[PDB]
């Protein structure tokens, strides 16, 4: 029961399944602090990001409702191995770090917005977080180091 999970029930079987409500990750096996930490994401902005524009697009127009949609379906291929997370970042990520795979580099805490870092530093090493929401937009974050 490391830093935010709790036990859960699901709701299409029964079975126990455990969720990190800082990282937002769900998983069925039962789970398991450093000075800095290196991840990688793929973001996905909306209409309401505090800068609604990216490579990809001048003028981003969905709705923060169609960017988690968006994000969600990412989330799936990458658990079921049908893409990997790096070629998803390079291609659909709205953000500038897309061209290096979604690698931001290695940070500590007191760099990235609260949600972010809150969820980057619960992640074990190779973990996966489900949909981040910051002022940017939805993030999913993948823990590399
Ligand atoms: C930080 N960073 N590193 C790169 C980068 C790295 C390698 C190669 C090229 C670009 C880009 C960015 C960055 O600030 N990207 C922002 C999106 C972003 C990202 C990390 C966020 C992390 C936390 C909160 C909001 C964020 C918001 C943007 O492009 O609008």
């Not at 079987?13 to 793929?42: D, K, M």
């Not at 996905?44 to 923060?64: A, F, L």
């Not at 929401?133 to 939805?138: E, M, R």
Request: proline letters at 5%; charged letters at 25%; glycine letters at 6%.
């Amino acid at each position: 029961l490391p830093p935010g999970w709790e036990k859960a029930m699901s709701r299409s079987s029964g079975r126990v399944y455990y969720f990190n409500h800082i990282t937002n990750a769900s998983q069925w096996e039962r789970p398991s602090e450093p000075a800095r930490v290196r991840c990688s994401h793929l973001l996905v902005k909306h209409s309401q990001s505090r800068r609604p524009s990216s490579w990809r697009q001048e003028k981003i127009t969905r709705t923060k409702e169609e960017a988690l949609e968006l994000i969600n379906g990412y989330i799936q291929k990458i658990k079921s191995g049908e893409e990997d997370f790096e070629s998803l970042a390079s291609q659909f990520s709205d953000c500038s770090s897309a061209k290096a795979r979604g690698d931001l580099g290695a940070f500590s805490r007191g760099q990235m917005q609260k949600p972010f870092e809150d969820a980057s530093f619960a992640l074990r090493t190779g973990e996966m977080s489900g949909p981040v929401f910051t002022d940017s937009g939805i993030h999913i974050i993948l823990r590399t180091e």
